[PDB]
Amino acid sequence: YVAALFFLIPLVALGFAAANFAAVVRKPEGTERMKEISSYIRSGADSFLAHETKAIFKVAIVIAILLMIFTTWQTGVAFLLGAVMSASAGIVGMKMATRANVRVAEAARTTKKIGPALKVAYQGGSVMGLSVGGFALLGLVLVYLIFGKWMGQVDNLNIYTNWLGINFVPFAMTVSGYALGCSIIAMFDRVGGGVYTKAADMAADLVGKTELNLPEDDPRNPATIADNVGDNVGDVAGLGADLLESFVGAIVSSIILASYMFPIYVQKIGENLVHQVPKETIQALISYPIFFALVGLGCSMLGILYVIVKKPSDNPQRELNISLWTSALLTVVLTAFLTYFYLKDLQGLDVLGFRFGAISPWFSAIIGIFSGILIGFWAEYYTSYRYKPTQFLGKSSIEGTGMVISNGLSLGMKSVFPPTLTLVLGILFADYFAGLYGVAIAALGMLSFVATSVSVDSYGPIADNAGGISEMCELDPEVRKITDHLDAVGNTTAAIGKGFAIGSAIFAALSLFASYMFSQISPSDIGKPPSLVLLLNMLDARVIAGALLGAAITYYFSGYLISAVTKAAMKMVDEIRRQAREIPGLLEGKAKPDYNRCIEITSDNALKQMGYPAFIAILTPLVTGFLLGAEFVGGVLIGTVLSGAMLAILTANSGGAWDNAKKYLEAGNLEGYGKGSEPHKALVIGDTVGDPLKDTVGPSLDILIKIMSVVSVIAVSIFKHVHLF
Amino acid sequence: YVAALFFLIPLVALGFAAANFAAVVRKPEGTERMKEISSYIRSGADSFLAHETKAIFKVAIVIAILLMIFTTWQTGVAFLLGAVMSASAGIVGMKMATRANVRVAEAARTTKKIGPALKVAYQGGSVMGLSVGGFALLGLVLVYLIFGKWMGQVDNLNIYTNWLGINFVPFAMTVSGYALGCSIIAMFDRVGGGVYTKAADMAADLVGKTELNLPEDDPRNPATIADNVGDNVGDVAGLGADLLESFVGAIVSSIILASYMFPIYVQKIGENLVHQVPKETIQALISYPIFFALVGLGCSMLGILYVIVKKPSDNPQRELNISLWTSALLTVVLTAFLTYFYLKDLQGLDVLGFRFGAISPWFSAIIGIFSGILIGFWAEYYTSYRYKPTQFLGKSSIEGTGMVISNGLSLGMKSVFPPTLTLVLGILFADYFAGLYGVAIAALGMLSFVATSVSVDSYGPIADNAGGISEMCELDPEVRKITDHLDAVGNTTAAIGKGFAIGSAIFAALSLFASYMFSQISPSDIGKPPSLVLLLNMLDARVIAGALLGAAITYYFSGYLISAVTKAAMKMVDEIRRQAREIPGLLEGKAKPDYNRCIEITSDNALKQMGYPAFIAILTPLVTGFLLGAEFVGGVLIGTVLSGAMLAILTANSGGAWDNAKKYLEAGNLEGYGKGSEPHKALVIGDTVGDPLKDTVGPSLDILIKIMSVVSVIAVSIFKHVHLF
Ligand SMILES: [Mg+2]
Ligand SMILES: [Mg+2]
Ligand SMILES: [Mg+2]
Ligand SMILES: [Mg+2]
Ligand SMILES: [Mg+2]
Ligand SMILES: [Mg+2]
Ligand SMILES: [Mg+2]
Ligand SMILES: [Mg+2]
Ligand SMILES: [Mg+2]
Ligand SMILES: [Mg+2]
Ligand code: NA
Ligand code: NA
């Protein structure tokens, strides 16, 4: 059937990724010295990611076994699968970037043009994007085919009850396991890599620029290699796992909602249950987001393929925007026909929230897509120095450091309102068209072109690394200016991707609130009306107290991450000072600095600290649940969603703005004052403040929300009646 | 009756305030220079507060008229009354502090002991505390006696419906007007004063300390007078209006809840309304928080008098802590007998949430008190340099400025979890004992000794001013050390007071959620069960979207305040640079700097910016309500409560910790590095970052929550059915 043809699409995506890999590795590579340093970075990155992968997969096996014990084994299986998929996305991403980075450098060096570097960098990110979409939908469609069709978990869709008292739906619990795996792995990865790269970058930039008057990425600085290796580890793999888990999060959210919808919407007539919605419609609504995601992936492929070729323009940001726009538009247009034809005659839609026929989920999809796009636009507005706010931030450096920090935090706080409002109208309209299912599908719509988003976002770290390499070998300033252009653009794309992630996370979070309320239902209370189930009252003390708690947990989470960064950051600062002092000829370029120490500090600290956050995210709903019940947990999830929603956008836009303001002054756009000036130092301090926020605190929330909510959805059946207080 | 005797108590409080005023003003003024500078500061402060009071009272008259039009005239009357009360608290506070600071300075100069300065400063704050409690309970009891007893608005307590379709309860609407007045005035005052003092302080500290190597509060600096005048305007009057409005907020919250409880708790038996709770019980529960607050005031008076007459010890923090502890304890003990005797035989307790007899609200009160105290303890822990976190923050300055900022924000975020948890258990337990009424009374309990809290908190600005004056006139360093001690202590007390404020604000916010749900009921819908009324479903799209929006509004609010500060801050920085450049002999102490310009900048900017925030706080529930209904507004209130709860504590504790870390290094507690070193500059920058956060952003939230929630509670009856979408 056509099903197999759609099953080909992720495989074609993987093939495209491998093709781009081959195309980029084909590049001639700059210099033997460049190859050497790049090989060093490869060694460090591969090492750290190896230790990471080891520990995280150990923990993943443990958790998976625990799931197979306390739930269905299919849960643990899908868990391991998704784990492998996300981890593989990370590994492929890094292994690609580490080799891809040199090509950009040589391109900009020889051609002295932005075009080539832009192209190779874009292909570099493309590999990772296609890897993300491909892996996600591959694992997903594997779960779907194997567990849903062969085992017939989509067949029954009735409320079950295994031992220990957990009320579950087989397929729902399975995909729950999948998404949970993805979330845990993503969290571990990006926390570790995050702390690593941010400690390294903070120390390097701070001491190097402000305490030694060294240029950015100077080989005299023993911390620069740590910065680049960190860029390869954190800003890359973490992003892949992140947006993969966000994509999966949205789709699996839709699937769970749809699946739980069927056995619940019964009408109790004289002790007889009457299914108000037929099984066929439900199954169709279960398969719908998968085929959706496949089509979206395809369109993303069309867009990316169109871009990597094409007549290269002198403006990269415009090109990437064209990529996203074309991918999104194609996605919309094809989704129209997909939605119309697939859901043509089901008749049972009117009962479960469909207002305007069967074209409703396409409308909700459009809502999600347009929402994501607007988020991108706003993010770019607040972070790029081509506009007012970042220009003001950079220009404000004349007044001091305190002004940089203050106006930075202010910018962060102000930049919250537009995408949040966009999300509000998004939720309201999606709910208007197709209700909760509409919201769940809108979450997917925002990330329907996840491949292009991940690509455009991953385009940045390659540029940053290319700059780091360009500075180390003392090249023509054309290389540095081009690479700085690409790097600033990348910094914008990061903020954009973050916005997408947190938005989709929020829609999916609402849908997961719905599913969470559904999951509480036992086979005995199957007759209860849907309206009485979907009820999470704020005036209940446990619920609002829950919200407050969850909020505080999010904030303390952020604080813990920041502290974790500042530890190795400080230690490395002291290390840089000590090396600059005790090594003669180091600052004169007549003595090679000890990079391995700087590597060791952040590596050790990251490996040590990385454990706690994920464990907290997993155990919180458990302990709060067993202590105070399900309502309290619902509250916790709410507060978490809100506070995470705010802090993510804040940190993202603020950090991006700070960095791009630094790069703004570094481009000499501010008259008189330059790289060695005091305002430059102020913007540098600002950037070092924004670093642990934008690349460690921000996304960790968008993961934490989904993992915590899914854990809650799964475990709720236990402490719903087995709560202590 | 005994009622008149209790009505005497606030008058005795005012008398005590006047007595302390006379006692302190009798103290000797140091030197003609001190008198001159103090007269200057007095002139500036009185001027700014005059303009402020003028504009704010114009707006207040307008709003009051609007209330008299669209609601009962009693609403507008009580509005004006409360307005006058809060404003008067501010005016008295400032007018007292401005004179007290010299007494403190001269005391520390002559005696070279901590005791005297501590005592006179404490009496200085005492005047303001007694002014706050006194004014609040005076206006409140005036409303009670006049509108409740003479007019008989406590008599009817039936659901009414005036023109325009607003369903109201007379007394409830009245005290709503009262609290609203207090909130609007407090907001205006502390926003204006906040921006004023913070721009000045930021510029002064930054340029003075780090760019000129000048000592803090050096007369060579043209911005120091602006800083001191600001301390008198912002940190004083703003605090008075703030905590007065918080006190009033809690009490009026209880009153509104209790009042609305009667016509709502009817049982519909065959088209017949059956009051499940008698009127006597309801009225008793209405009077209860007032007499509660009166007793608390009395106990506060006992504590304060005990301290001011006590034998002065070399340790101030211990003395203030003893004050708070004794006040709280006395409050508890007397409240026990009050609660037992007053609520002896009411019969209606079992129906409306009272679990353990009639002693329940005393238990909830104890919960609130202990909660507030614990908040104080945690605040002191995180902010004082006598403990680990602030010490680490100060010591971290060796690693750079970015580390100071990062660890500061980290401290802020981490310090959120303990008092939030305290508030969670507080809410849960209060609800366990006496439900929503329990929570509402707990809000009062936390601030039962509001006089002592305001006193202890206001003790600080006087000390800070004493230090500024001592430095300006070039005195013995022992004076500076004493005043620095007292000032750091003051900085701790500030954080404590903020914690109290936001806590009480949150409890009262829950109770106001309840009252908000109550207010929607029309006379036709009077028969509806209480359980179905108290329902705010999160899964409703409007509600969660509301939460997101409100959250974003809180964040953008904070951002706007920060920006407003940074405007005049930057302008003043440029002014200081310009004066230092163009005025010869300025830095040599041979030319008097132009302070009036620095005054003018912050004055103009503050007067300009102060308008918007209050207007937003008032208009948001209106526009969002008319647009999307009552549920959406409920959501907005939720998100507002949560985000405000987090940001307030964050900014407060972070700012306090930063400041006391600066003071920690300035005391030479960090070996080797001193006032002129680079780590000192780092801590200075950190302090300038924390300044606009803790003294402009923080409390503004605790006001915004209550003003917005009250406005919503009042206006809800209109757009509940006259909503556009
Ligand atoms: Mg950097
Ligand atoms: Mg980097
Ligand atoms: Mg770099
Ligand atoms: Mg960057
Ligand atoms: Mg950085
Ligand atoms: Mg200061
Ligand atoms: Mg001050
Ligand atoms: Mg001062
Ligand atoms: Mg201070
Ligand atoms: Mg300050
Ligand atoms: Na994610
Ligand atoms: Na207040």
Numbering used by the authors:
A (entry chain B), B (entry chain A): 2 to 726
Share the article's original sentences.
In TmPPase:IDP, an Mg5IDP-complex was fit into the positive Fo–Fc density in the hydrolytic centre and then refined. The coordination of Mg2+ and IDP is almost identical to that seen in VrPPase:IDP12, even though the two enzymes pump different ions. Positive Fo–Fc density was seen in TmPPase:IDP between residues D6.50, E6.53, S6.54 and D16.46. A sodium ion was therefore refined into this density. All of these results indicate that the density is most likely a bound Na+ and not a water molecule. Close to this, K16.50, which forms an ion-triplet in the resting-state TmPPase structure with D6.50 and E6.53, adopts a different orientation and the K16.50 Nζ is disordered. In TmPPase, sodium binding is facilitated by the inward motion of D16.46 into the sodium-binding site and by the movement of TMHs 6 and 16, which is almost twice as big as that in VrPPase.
Membrane-bound pyrophosphatases (M-PPases) are enzymes that couple the synthesis or hydrolysis of pyrophosphate (PPi) to the vectorial transport of protons and/or sodium ions. In addition, M-PPases can be divided into seven functional classes on the basis of their monovalent cation binding (K+-dependent and K+-independent enzymes) and pumping specificity (H+-pumps (H+-PPases), Na+-pumps (Na+-PPases) and H+ and Na+ co-pumps (Na+/H+-PPases)) and on the placement of a ‘semi-conserved glutamate' essential for pumping activity. So far, the structures of two M-PPases have been solved in three different states: TmPPase in resting and product-bound states (TmPPase:Ca:Mg and TmPPase:Pi2, respectively)11 and VrPPase in a substrate-analogue imidodiphosphate (IDP)-bound state (VrPPase:IDP)12. These structures have shown that M-PPases are homodimers, with each protomer having 16 transmembrane helices (TMHs) and a vertically arranged, continuous active site structure with four distinctive parts: ‘hydrolytic centre', ‘coupling funnel', ‘ion gate' and ‘exit channel'3.
